[PDB]
Amino acid sequence: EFNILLATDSYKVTHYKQYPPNTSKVYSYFECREKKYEETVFYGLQYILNKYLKGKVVTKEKIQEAKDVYKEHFQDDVFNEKGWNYILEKYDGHLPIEIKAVPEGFVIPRGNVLFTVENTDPECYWLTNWIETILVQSWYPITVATNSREQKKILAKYLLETSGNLDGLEYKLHDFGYRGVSSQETAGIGASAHLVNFKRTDTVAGLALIKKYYGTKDPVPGYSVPAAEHSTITAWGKDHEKDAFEHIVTQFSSVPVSVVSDSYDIYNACEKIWGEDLRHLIVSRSTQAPLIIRPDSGNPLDTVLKVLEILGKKFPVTENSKGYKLLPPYLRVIQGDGVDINTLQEIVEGMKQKMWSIENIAFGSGGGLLQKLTRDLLNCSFKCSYVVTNGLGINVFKDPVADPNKRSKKGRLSLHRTPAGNFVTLEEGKGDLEEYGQDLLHTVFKNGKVTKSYSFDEIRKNAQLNIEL
Amino acid sequence: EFNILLATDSYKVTHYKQYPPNTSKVYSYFECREKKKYEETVFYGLQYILNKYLKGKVVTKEKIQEAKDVYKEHFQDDVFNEKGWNYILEKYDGHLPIEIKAVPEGFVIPRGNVLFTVENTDPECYWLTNWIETILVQSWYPITVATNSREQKKILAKYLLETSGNLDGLEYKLHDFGYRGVSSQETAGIGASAHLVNFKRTDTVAGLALIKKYYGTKDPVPGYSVPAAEHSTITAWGKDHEKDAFEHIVTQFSSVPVSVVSDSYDIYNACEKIWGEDLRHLIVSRSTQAPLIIRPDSGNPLDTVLKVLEILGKKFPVTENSKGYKLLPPYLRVIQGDGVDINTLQEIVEGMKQKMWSIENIAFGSGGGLLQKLTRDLLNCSFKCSYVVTNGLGINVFKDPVADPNKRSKKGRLSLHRTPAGNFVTLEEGKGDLEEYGQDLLHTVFKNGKVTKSYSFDEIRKNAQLNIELE
């Protein structure tokens, strides 16, 4: 069972002894610090609040467990047993913490306050930063959602330019990341974050998380389609690749089906097997049930371009209203190898230069979508900005001489709309001067209760692209 | 509750309809594929997965119906092998009819070798071997963390040996700071445990419980920490009271090691004037078992470490050790815990050696670099089908993409052996059966729902030792 007393960085166990004597309040905030990625999608805090922070999170057993572990871990007795007991006895184990946050799905420029944390009981001054570690992990869903959305911007731009519209945009980036992430829990969180922007996923874990923690009007937030993997082709034997293809497309004759075509020779598969031997099984398919040819090796751009050129000569290609080449509607391509935001950009621009519509293509991304991301990408950071000691409030901050980029904000913070309709973060409690209207943060957690929440539908609406709006 | 029927890549739900008819066996294997450096990998983490997710009654009526309901909406189609899953439930009381054989955990194996294999034990369950690919492949993560951590240990060992003449304290020189920088609580536990294969310092507490539950140590705990400040415990005193914060903290922790972050405003002022003059009397009186550990946390990591040492070396009594390298007094040490990964670690210790500073003086903290900035393609961790039986005939299968020879996979039934020179070789096409290469190093670790062989965390550590530690 999860124990919040054991879910922090070890050194934080010793911090209650380090703050100034008679400190009654510790107030801290999270931002994606300013230094590509000029704006971030706020997503994921609600999951953390519900799964880990709400309700009775302290018991006698959990306190004893943490005491016993930390005694051995530090080779010394430094654990604040009394402080945790206070929370157990006074609040029935509910955390005396208040969290204010921007609404989930909101798209906010870097360097703005996204959420704040403060203790609601003076005895629990130490609790604010105890939970830094668990709250800071919000960096991951924020970062997946943001990087996913930046890829949606690229796709929308090139789809609009080559086809004249955005039809199918939300199906153009398919999460293949389940095997390439670091755990089952990460799989669910990361997939859910991708689904803020798109509707295609093979990472099943994301569905249950969304259903449990957020909710959608639709039965599921994300979809997949039948597809082969290398084993369902190669198992037929090296001389029987054609037999494999035929069986598979016949088994899935009236739904879309993706068939990995590079087990031995992608160019042969496209030109000779699909393009000649099995062509009669492709040209007979429904617009609602295309074959999706899937290359999976080689230089992604060169391979996509060559596959398209091959198919373009074996199948009837049309020219859309924008002047770009379009495969017949029973035939599409998916590139699911080596795709990240950079190579995605390179492929669509390369297609555009060769006059191929982005209609023709979809992308699968795994490690690039859900794993190859760190807290440094958006400088996701949690810092103390305000304390009260001896009944006096002090605005606090860091400002390292050798890195002004690491300077933190001072005092009590609030988020506001500017006269031009942008966001601004006011420091030093200046939000109280009421020169900038109401604070846009909302209380989302207070004294063990989740006080405000968002459906996955409203998160999606908040996260929409300008061009979509 | 966890449902194994919902723990695969979506497309795998459709694969039972795609294999050749009359297929009774699907046999697959995992390797860290060679790539035309990380030449050897630590095999670690499978036991966690076997116990947490694969063993026992993992199929129930309710889990089957749950999966059916989800996949109906997810695919907008009824494709789902309910009969296949029902069979496992009825015939095996929901235990997976799978055999997994694996190299012992902790083993250090060169790239391009079989590390584990997977096959179905019942012909009806040919589809199940690759169903569980997704969950098993996630073993890439503890493998890669353990491997990358160990490679950093090699660098530390080489430089510690060169600059000091021994390896004392080597296991305490890389401290896991990664808890907040990983993607989830579960990941934190797994990654932290992987680091602890090589080292003993961690703030990622989640790793301890995982190890205790799934592996076990003779010692009460596998990993340790020491009291340390963060910026909040310094800055809360106010900008003009950094010295008061330092004093309060070192006095609170006067008899144990304590790390104090010293760059809140001006790291160089802090070292030279605050530690080096104002509070010097509190530092020089400390025990060798309770040093002050000064922590810079910003600026160019190499440049800053060198300047911190230069400053401290002129405020404190420095000795020259038997190797000719400078050494701070035993009550004073430094930890660089910002921007550390395997590359910057190498650059720092090399820069230190150039400036004649012993590696004894320094320790490292690594967070994102240690537990998060790693992917499955770092070691090309990969799971492929190499053997099937169709119509009673075994056939050796593989992929071999024309444009990428590096993605070619192995053929047939596999086994891992010692070579005459003591190295490793993976035999293909069932050639291990010729018995020309002594015993298969793969052991059955899972069979029909039961974990059949387990390793303690102590055995794993012994297996993962550096050669230099052995010598």
mmCIF file of N, CA, C and O in Angstrom, chain A residues 186-234:
data_model
loop_
_atom_site.group_PDB
_atom_site.id
_atom_site.type_symbol
_atom_site.label_atom_id
_atom_site.label_comp_id
_atom_site.label_asym_id
_atom_site.label_seq_id
_atom_site.Cartn_x
_atom_site.Cartn_y
_atom_site.Cartn_z
ATOM 1 N N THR A 186 3.502 4.998 -15.368
ATOM 2 C CA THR A 186 3.897 5.990 -16.361
ATOM 3 C C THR A 186 3.147 5.824 -17.689
ATOM 4 O O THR A 186 2.759 6.805 -18.329
ATOM 5 N N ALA A 187 2.956 4.581 -18.109
ATOM 6 C CA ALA A 187 2.194 4.300 -19.329
ATOM 7 C C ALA A 187 0.804 4.965 -19.292
ATOM 8 O O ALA A 187 0.419 5.661 -20.227
ATOM 9 N N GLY A 188 0.081 4.761 -18.195
ATOM 10 C CA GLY A 188 -1.257 5.310 -18.041
ATOM 11 C C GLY A 188 -1.271 6.831 -18.030
ATOM 12 O O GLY A 188 -2.072 7.462 -18.737
ATOM 13 N N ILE A 189 -0.393 7.425 -17.224
ATOM 14 C CA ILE A 189 -0.299 8.885 -17.135
ATOM 15 C C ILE A 189 0.079 9.497 -18.488
ATOM 16 O O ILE A 189 -0.592 10.412 -18.980
ATOM 17 N N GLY A 190 1.165 9.003 -19.080
ATOM 18 C CA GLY A 190 1.630 9.528 -20.361
ATOM 19 C C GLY A 190 0.607 9.377 -21.484
ATOM 20 O O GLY A 190 0.399 10.300 -22.273
ATOM 21 N N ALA A 191 -0.004 8.200 -21.594
ATOM 22 C CA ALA A 191 -1.028 7.994 -22.624
ATOM 23 C C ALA A 191 -2.191 8.955 -22.421
ATOM 24 O O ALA A 191 -2.711 9.522 -23.379
ATOM 25 N N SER A 192 -2.592 9.144 -21.169
ATOM 26 C CA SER A 192 -3.710 10.028 -20.889
ATOM 27 C C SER A 192 -3.365 11.434 -21.370
ATOM 28 O O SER A 192 -4.205 12.118 -21.937
ATOM 29 N N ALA A 193 -2.106 11.831 -21.197
ATOM 30 C CA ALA A 193 -1.662 13.164 -21.576
ATOM 31 C C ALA A 193 -1.664 13.362 -23.090
ATOM 32 O O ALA A 193 -2.014 14.431 -23.588
ATOM 33 N N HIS A 194 -1.261 12.329 -23.827
ATOM 34 C CA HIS A 194 -1.311 12.385 -25.279
ATOM 35 C C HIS A 194 -2.773 12.547 -25.736
ATOM 36 O O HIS A 194 -3.066 13.287 -26.679
ATOM 37 N N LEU A 195 -3.687 11.908 -25.011
ATOM 38 C CA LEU A 195 -5.106 11.874 -25.392
ATOM 39 C C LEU A 195 -5.793 13.218 -25.172
ATOM 40 O O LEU A 195 -6.919 13.427 -25.617
ATOM 41 N N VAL A 196 -5.095 14.135 -24.502
ATOM 42 C CA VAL A 196 -5.556 15.515 -24.404
ATOM 43 C C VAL A 196 -5.641 16.130 -25.803
ATOM 44 O O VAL A 196 -6.503 16.959 -26.079
ATOM 45 N N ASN A 197 -4.759 15.683 -26.693
ATOM 46 C CA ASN A 197 -4.628 16.254 -28.031
ATOM 47 C C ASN A 197 -5.128 15.375 -29.172
ATOM 48 O O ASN A 197 -5.573 15.884 -30.201
ATOM 49 N N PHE A 198 -5.005 14.063 -28.998
ATOM 50 C CA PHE A 198 -5.297 13.102 -30.055
ATOM 51 C C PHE A 198 -6.231 11.993 -29.556
ATOM 52 O O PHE A 198 -6.528 11.903 -28.354
ATOM 53 N N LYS A 199 -6.691 11.158 -30.485
ATOM 54 C CA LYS A 199 -7.633 10.092 -30.183
ATOM 55 C C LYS A 199 -7.123 8.691 -30.535
ATOM 56 O O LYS A 199 -7.851 7.718 -30.374
ATOM 57 N N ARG A 200 -5.883 8.585 -31.008
ATOM 58 C CA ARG A 200 -5.321 7.275 -31.355
ATOM 59 C C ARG A 200 -4.264 6.831 -30.357
ATOM 60 O O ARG A 200 -3.297 7.547 -30.102
ATOM 61 N N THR A 201 -4.459 5.648 -29.785
ATOM 62 C CA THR A 201 -3.503 5.118 -28.826
ATOM 63 C C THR A 201 -3.551 3.594 -28.768
ATOM 64 O O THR A 201 -4.619 2.998 -28.931
ATOM 65 N N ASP A 202 -2.387 2.979 -28.562
ATOM 66 C CA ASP A 202 -2.286 1.544 -28.278
ATOM 67 C C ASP A 202 -1.943 1.328 -26.805
ATOM 68 O O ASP A 202 -1.838 0.193 -26.328
ATOM 69 N N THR A 203 -1.756 2.425 -26.083
ATOM 70 C CA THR A 203 -1.407 2.337 -24.671
ATOM 71 C C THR A 203 -2.688 2.284 -23.827
ATOM 72 O O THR A 203 -3.172 3.300 -23.293
ATOM 73 N N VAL A 204 -3.232 1.075 -23.726
ATOM 74 C CA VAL A 204 -4.556 0.827 -23.148
ATOM 75 C C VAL A 204 -4.704 1.398 -21.740
ATOM 76 O O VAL A 204 -5.784 1.834 -21.338
ATOM 77 N N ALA A 205 -3.594 1.429 -21.011
ATOM 78 C CA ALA A 205 -3.583 1.898 -19.627
ATOM 79 C C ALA A 205 -4.141 3.322 -19.472
ATOM 80 O O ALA A 205 -4.665 3.691 -18.423
ATOM 81 N N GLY A 206 -4.035 4.121 -20.525
ATOM 82 C CA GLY A 206 -4.512 5.494 -20.470
ATOM 83 C C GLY A 206 -6.027 5.618 -20.351
ATOM 84 O O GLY A 206 -6.539 6.568 -19.751
ATOM 85 N N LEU A 207 -6.751 4.653 -20.912
ATOM 86 C CA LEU A 207 -8.207 4.702 -20.886
ATOM 87 C C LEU A 207 -8.753 4.629 -19.457
ATOM 88 O O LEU A 207 -9.598 5.436 -19.068
ATOM 89 N N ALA A 208 -8.275 3.655 -18.692
ATOM 90 C CA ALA A 208 -8.769 3.432 -17.337
ATOM 91 C C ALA A 208 -8.469 4.616 -16.428
ATOM 92 O O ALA A 208 -9.278 4.981 -15.569
ATOM 93 N N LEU A 209 -7.297 5.210 -16.615
ATOM 94 C CA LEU A 209 -6.913 6.360 -15.816
ATOM 95 C C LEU A 209 -7.877 7.516 -16.075
ATOM 96 O O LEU A 209 -8.399 8.132 -15.138
ATOM 97 N N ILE A 210 -8.112 7.818 -17.346
ATOM 98 C CA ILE A 210 -9.023 8.906 -17.686
ATOM 99 C C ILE A 210 -10.427 8.635 -17.132
ATOM 100 O O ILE A 210 -11.053 9.505 -16.530
ATOM 101 N N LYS A 211 -10.896 7.408 -17.303
ATOM 102 C CA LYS A 211 -12.233 7.043 -16.846
ATOM 103 C C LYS A 211 -12.366 7.189 -15.322
ATOM 104 O O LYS A 211 -13.398 7.607 -14.816
ATOM 105 N N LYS A 212 -11.308 6.857 -14.597
ATOM 106 C CA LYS A 212 -11.348 6.893 -13.138
ATOM 107 C C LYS A 212 -11.175 8.300 -12.569
ATOM 108 O O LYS A 212 -11.843 8.670 -11.605
ATOM 109 N N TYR A 213 -10.282 9.081 -13.171
ATOM 110 C CA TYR A 213 -9.868 10.353 -12.577
ATOM 111 C C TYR A 213 -10.438 11.601 -13.232
ATOM 112 O O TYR A 213 -10.442 12.666 -12.620
ATOM 113 N N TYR A 214 -10.918 11.482 -14.466
ATOM 114 C CA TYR A 214 -11.359 12.671 -15.202
ATOM 115 C C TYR A 214 -12.772 12.535 -15.772
ATOM 116 O O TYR A 214 -13.636 13.373 -15.497
ATOM 117 N N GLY A 215 -12.982 11.490 -16.572
ATOM 118 C CA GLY A 215 -14.283 11.187 -17.161
ATOM 119 C C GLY A 215 -14.510 11.802 -18.532
ATOM 120 O O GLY A 215 -14.097 12.936 -18.786
ATOM 121 N N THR A 216 -15.179 11.062 -19.418
ATOM 122 C CA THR A 216 -15.562 11.581 -20.731
ATOM 123 C C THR A 216 -17.021 11.242 -20.986
ATOM 124 O O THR A 216 -17.528 10.248 -20.465
ATOM 125 N N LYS A 217 -17.689 12.057 -21.793
ATOM 126 C CA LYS A 217 -19.048 11.726 -22.229
ATOM 127 C C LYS A 217 -19.022 10.465 -23.092
ATOM 128 O O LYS A 217 -19.868 9.590 -22.952
ATOM 129 N N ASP A 218 -18.036 10.370 -23.976
ATOM 130 C CA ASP A 218 -17.839 9.159 -24.770
ATOM 131 C C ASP A 218 -17.446 7.975 -23.885
ATOM 132 O O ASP A 218 -16.833 8.158 -22.832
ATOM 133 N N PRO A 219 -17.802 6.750 -24.309
ATOM 134 C CA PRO A 219 -17.390 5.537 -23.585
ATOM 135 C C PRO A 219 -15.875 5.441 -23.362
ATOM 136 O O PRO A 219 -15.453 5.103 -22.254
ATOM 137 N N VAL A 220 -15.078 5.719 -24.393
ATOM 138 C CA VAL A 220 -13.617 5.754 -24.236
ATOM 139 C C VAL A 220 -13.019 7.025 -24.835
ATOM 140 O O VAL A 220 -13.580 7.608 -25.763
ATOM 141 N N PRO A 221 -11.877 7.478 -24.288
ATOM 142 C CA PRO A 221 -11.276 8.695 -24.840
ATOM 143 C C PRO A 221 -10.392 8.419 -26.061
ATOM 144 O O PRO A 221 -10.103 9.339 -26.828
ATOM 145 N N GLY A 222 -9.974 7.170 -26.244
ATOM 146 C CA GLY A 222 -9.041 6.842 -27.310
ATOM 147 C C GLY A 222 -9.319 5.524 -28.004
ATOM 148 O O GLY A 222 -9.940 4.622 -27.429
ATOM 149 N N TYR A 223 -8.832 5.412 -29.240
ATOM 150 C CA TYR A 223 -9.178 4.303 -30.124
ATOM 151 C C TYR A 223 -7.952 3.708 -30.787
ATOM 152 O O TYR A 223 -6.913 4.362 -30.882
ATOM 153 N N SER A 224 -8.085 2.465 -31.239
ATOM 154 C CA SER A 224 -7.049 1.828 -32.042
ATOM 155 C C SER A 224 -7.674 1.103 -33.222
ATOM 156 O O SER A 224 -8.895 1.075 -33.360
ATOM 157 N N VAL A 225 -6.835 0.524 -34.082
ATOM 158 C CA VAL A 225 -7.317 -0.268 -35.207
ATOM 159 C C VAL A 225 -6.470 -1.530 -35.304
ATOM 160 O O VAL A 225 -5.310 -1.542 -34.839
ATOM 161 N N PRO A 226 -7.041 -2.590 -35.893
ATOM 162 C CA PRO A 226 -6.274 -3.820 -36.067
ATOM 163 C C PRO A 226 -4.968 -3.516 -36.788
ATOM 164 O O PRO A 226 -4.902 -2.654 -37.680
ATOM 165 N N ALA A 227 -3.914 -4.189 -36.355
ATOM 166 C CA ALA A 227 -2.611 -3.996 -36.961
ATOM 167 C C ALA A 227 -1.751 -5.226 -36.745
ATOM 168 O O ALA A 227 -1.879 -5.901 -35.722
ATOM 169 N N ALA A 228 -0.873 -5.512 -37.706
ATOM 170 C CA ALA A 228 0.109 -6.575 -37.555
ATOM 171 C C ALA A 228 1.334 -6.096 -36.768
ATOM 172 O O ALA A 228 1.562 -4.905 -36.636
ATOM 173 N N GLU A 229 2.105 -7.037 -36.238
ATOM 174 C CA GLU A 229 3.464 -6.752 -35.779
ATOM 175 C C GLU A 229 4.371 -7.681 -36.558
ATOM 176 O O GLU A 229 3.892 -8.511 -37.338
ATOM 177 N N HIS A 230 5.679 -7.566 -36.349
ATOM 178 C CA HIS A 230 6.594 -8.399 -37.119
ATOM 179 C C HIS A 230 6.342 -9.893 -36.921
ATOM 180 O O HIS A 230 6.413 -10.667 -37.874
ATOM 181 N N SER A 231 6.003 -10.293 -35.699
ATOM 182 C CA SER A 231 5.815 -11.718 -35.420
ATOM 183 C C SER A 231 4.639 -12.334 -36.178
ATOM 184 O O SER A 231 4.682 -13.507 -36.543
ATOM 185 N N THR A 232 3.592 -11.558 -36.440
ATOM 186 C CA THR A 232 2.467 -12.129 -37.184
ATOM 187 C C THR A 232 2.745 -12.198 -38.690
ATOM 188 O O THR A 232 1.975 -12.805 -39.438
ATOM 189 N N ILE A 233 3.835 -11.574 -39.137
ATOM 190 C CA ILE A 233 4.282 -11.770 -40.520
ATOM 191 C C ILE A 233 5.357 -12.864 -40.606
ATOM 192 O O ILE A 233 5.235 -13.833 -41.371
ATOM 193 N N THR A 234 6.423 -12.695 -39.831
ATOM 194 C CA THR A 234 7.572 -13.580 -39.920
ATOM 195 C C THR A 234 7.251 -15.015 -39.514
ATOM 196 O O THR A 234 7.882 -15.944 -40.017
#
